[PDB]
Amino acid sequence: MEKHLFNLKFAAKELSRSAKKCDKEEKAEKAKIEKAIQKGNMEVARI
């Protein structure tokens, strides 16, 4: 059962790291929203 316990803890760590990288990519995309509105590209801003 130790292999499945290791796999469940590894899956929880992978989901936590996925949440961390998605919260980082949210800030990156918001910086890109600001740069696209400063350049005047509204379709790029909506993407």
Binding site: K30, I33, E34, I37, Q38, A45, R46
Partner: peptide
Amino acid sequence: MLLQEMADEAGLDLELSQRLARLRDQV
């Protein structure tokens, strides 16, 4: 709302389900 917020921050300047549900309830 996110586009409205981040366009007002740069200074560009660019309910219904209940109403339509009540109107489906009417006819």
